[PDB]
Structure formats: structure tokens, C-alpha cells
């Protein structure tokens, strides 16, 4: 989980990085006991009992989303960000964690580091990175000539300033999911 809190610049929602977790001793006790984390919801089973559970593989994603959009990520639930950027599959047996970083990601003079996907033709697949800067959000006219009207760059700027409120403030977020078809371990 060292990379989970050691990335100075988190991945933007459209470009969500994927990391692989395996062959190690899990510390969900660290997750719900650290007490610095702002949010902790694990849909698959009660988070405390998860330490006993053993799985073949683990998958994790780190991205920064606004406080307003944190509610959007859920299995069977979405939002404008979830529909075109990142969303949760109907069966998720892991957890969703959020930690606010007001000082780290709200620099003075504007933040050009983070941008968010705004337009897609249809709902994207869960766990799908449409990182490609595909344009052509128009239809009647080819987008090649100009962004005259419907045509637009589907990537938009999420500028940040210290005055931004909690919903405006960037909240770092991670998601966890497991499957067995090598990750667990009792101790004491």
C-alpha cells in the first residue's frame, strides 16, 4: 500500500492508473484503524471480517474525484463521471476509500495537473480505461475541421484554488476488488 499514499501526483479520473496487488500479507486493520482516512465503505462483506478471507488475485485503482462525485462510485450506481470515465461493476467484493488532501492538491495560482473526461457516445464498460483522447463528440459534422458546436475536446480543466470548499476540494480515492478461480494470512 506504499504507493497508495506515496504518489505525490494521483492519476486523473479519465487516465486512471491500474496497479496489481498480490503475494503479500493484507492489513485491512491498517485501513480502518489508521484514523486519518476520511471515508471507508466496503460493499462485499463487513470490512472487519475481510482479513480472514483469502483470494487468488487483487486489483486496485487510484484517482482523485470531487467530494460531490464520491457518492457516484458504487456497484450498480453511477453518475456523469462514472458513465463516461470510471464506474463500478454490478458485483464488487472489495472496498472504496477516500482521503482529502487540501494542502497537497489545492496549490495557489491554479492546478493544471488534473483534467476530467466529460463526453462519451455511450456508457463505458466497468474497469475500462478510455484514456485515449478520442474526439468526435459531434455526429452530424466530422470533428476534424473544428469544435464548432457539438464538437468539443471531451477533456475539461479541473482548476483548483485554496478557497475551494469540501465538494470542490480534490478527494484522493482508491478502489479494491478480489477474485479466486495468494492474498491473505492469519497472524497473532
Amino acid at each position, epitope marked *: 500500500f506504499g504507493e497508495v499514499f506515496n504518489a505525490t501526483r494521483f492519476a486523473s479520473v479519465y487516465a486512471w492508473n491500474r496497479k496489481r496487488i498480490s503475494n503479500c500479507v493484507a492489513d485491512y486493520s491498517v485501513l480502518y484503524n489508521s484514523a486519518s482516512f476520511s471515508t471507508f465503505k466496503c460493499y462485499g462483506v463487513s470490512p472487519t471480517k475481510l482479513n480472514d478471507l483469502c483470494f487468488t488475485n487483487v486489483y486496485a485503482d487510484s484517482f482523485v474525484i470531487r467530494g460531490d462525485e464520491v457518492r457516484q462510485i458504487a456497484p450498480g450506481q453511477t453518475g456523469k463521471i462514472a458513465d463516461y470515465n470510471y464506474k463500478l461493476p454490478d458485483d464488487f467484493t472489495g472496498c472504496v476509500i477516500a482521503w482529502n488532501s487540501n494542502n497537497l492538491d489545492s496549490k495557489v495560482g*491554479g492546478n*493544471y495537473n488534473y483534467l476530467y473526461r466529460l463526453f462519451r457516445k455511450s456508457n463505458l464498460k466497468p474497469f475500462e480505461r478510455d484514456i485515449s483522447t478520442e474526439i468526435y463528440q459531434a455526429g*452530424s459534422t466530422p470533428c476534424n475541421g*473544428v*469544435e*464548432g*458546436f*457539438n464538437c*468539443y*475536446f471531451p477533456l475539461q*480543466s479541473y*482548476g483548483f484554488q485554496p478557497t475551494n470548499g469540501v465538494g470542490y476540494q480534490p478527494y484522493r480515492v482508491v478502489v479494491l476488488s478480489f477474485e479466486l478461480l495468494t492474498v491473505c494470512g492469519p497472524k497473532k
Partner: antibody
Framework: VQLVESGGGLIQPGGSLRLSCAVSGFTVSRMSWVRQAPGKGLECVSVIYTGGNTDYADSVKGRFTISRDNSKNTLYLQMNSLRAEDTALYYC?????????????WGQGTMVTVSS | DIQMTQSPSSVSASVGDRVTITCRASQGISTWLAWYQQKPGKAPKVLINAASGLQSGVPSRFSGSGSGTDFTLTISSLQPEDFATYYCQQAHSFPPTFGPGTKL
């Protein structure tokens, strides 16, 4: 939030006028120019895009230079080919937005007269 | 420019009643209109999100369906803020062109 402009005034025809408007509350992205005739309805005309693509209506096609400054957040418009049809209230609005061509955050603008 | 007409071209004082805004297609406009509210001495603002796909970020009082030649919308009730000049804009193609407009 509030876009501020200067240089809107009566001028003799041919004079070169630079119109400056200030982006407020957001990182510089898009600016559009819309003109309203005094005691008459407004009419959309010249626009610029964040992509650097440019659209000018037949009223200002090839006659208006539209630009913004990322460093100073000051929008640059240079008056060229002064004509009776274009002169009137001038407004700097967001260039485009929404699902389709939507401008929402506006400023006071600079009403412009032309005469002797 | 574009050729369309907006009604009611003339508006008498509207008291305790629904107000209707209408315009007619020139480019086969479908869900391509943005409604406007303006106060004199102030910058004009959109009265709706234009509902190109769905109406949003607007009080439900102004709701209408624009497609084909029908671009009509209704206002729930008269208000001091609702006492406001209204206009329409061409949306599908360049240049966007404003409809005649009406004031209260």
C-alpha cells in the same frame, strides 16, 4: 464570476481599438463575442476555441482577431475593418460549453458607437 | 442568419398564470435551443441549460420540448424575478441567430 472590459466608446471610423476582457474564477479556456444593437436585439458573431480552432460569422469573417492571454487572463480583441453593422453593445462571454454551444458566465462588456 | 419567428411577439402583464415561450424550425432543429433571462443594466443569463440532451441546473418551472418545428416551453408562475426579457438562439449551425424576443 465577473469579466471586466475597457475601450468601448464612440470613435471615428478606421480607428484601431483593442478590447480587453478579464477571465474570472476559472482557468483560461474559451471566449466569445456577442453584439446587441442599441434599442434592438443581440446577435452572436465571433468566437475562439480552447483547442485553438477559430469560428467567425459572415459579419466578422476574416475581419476580427480574437484571442486570450493564459499568463495575464486578459482577452485580446483587435478592431479591424470597422463597419456599421458590427458597431453596438459588445459582450465577452464564454466561447462555448454545455452539451452544445452553451455560454453562461458573462461580464458587463463594452458598448461601442461609431459616428463622426 | 436563420429564418424563424418567436411568440408571443407581444406580451401583456402576466398575473398568476403559466407563461409560454415558442419558436419555429429553420434548420430542422431538434432539442437545439437555449432559453435566456436578462435584466436591463445587467449581463443576460441562460434561463435553462438548453436541454440539448436533458434539462438540468434549472428550476423545473421553465420546462419545454423542442424538436421538429415545435420549440415550446412553459413557466410555472409569475414572480418579480420572472418579470424578465426573454430570447431564443439558433443552436444547430453557425452563426447562432437570436429570435425576435419579448419583454414584460
Amino acid at each position: 464570476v465577473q469579466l471586466v472590459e475597457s475601450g468601448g466608446g464612440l470613435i471615428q471610423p478606421g480607428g484601431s481599438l483593442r478590447l480587453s476582457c478579464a477571465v474570472s474564477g476559472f482557468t483560461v479556456s474559451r471566449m466569445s463575442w456577442v453584439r446587441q444593437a442599441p434599442g434592438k436585439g443581440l446577435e452572436c458573431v465571433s468566437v475562439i476555441y480552447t483547442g485553438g480552432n477559430t469560428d467567425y460569422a459572415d459579419s466578422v469573417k476574416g475581419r476580427f482577431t480574437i484571442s486570450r492571454d493564459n499568463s495575464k487572463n486578459t482577452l485580446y480583441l483587435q478592431m479591424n475593418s470597422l463597419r456599421a453593422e458590427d458597431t453596438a453593445l459588445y459582450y465577452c462571454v464564454r466561447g462555448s460549453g454545455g452539451i452544445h454551444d452553451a455560454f453562461d458566465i458573462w461580464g458587463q462588456g463594452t458598448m461601442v458607437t461609431v459616428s463622426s | 442568419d436563420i429564418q424563424m419567428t418567436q411568440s408571443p411577439s407581444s406580451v401583456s402583464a402576466s398575473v398568476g398564470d403559466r407563461v409560454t415561450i415558442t419558436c419555429r424550425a429553420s434548420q430542422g432543429i431538434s432539442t437545439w435551443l437555449a432559453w435566456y433571462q436578462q435584466k436591463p443594466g445587467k449581463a443576460p443569463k441562460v434561463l435553462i441549460n438548453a436541454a440539448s440532451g436533458l434539462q438540468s441546473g434549472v428550476p423545473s418551472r421553465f420546462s419545454g420540448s423542442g424538436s421538429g418545428t415545435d420549440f415550446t416551453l412553459t413557466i410555472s408562475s409569475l414572480q418579480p424575478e420572472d418579470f424578465a426579457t426573454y430570447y431564443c438562439q439558433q443552436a444547430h449551425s453557425f452563426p447562432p441567430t437570436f429570435g425576435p424576443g419579448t419583454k414584460l
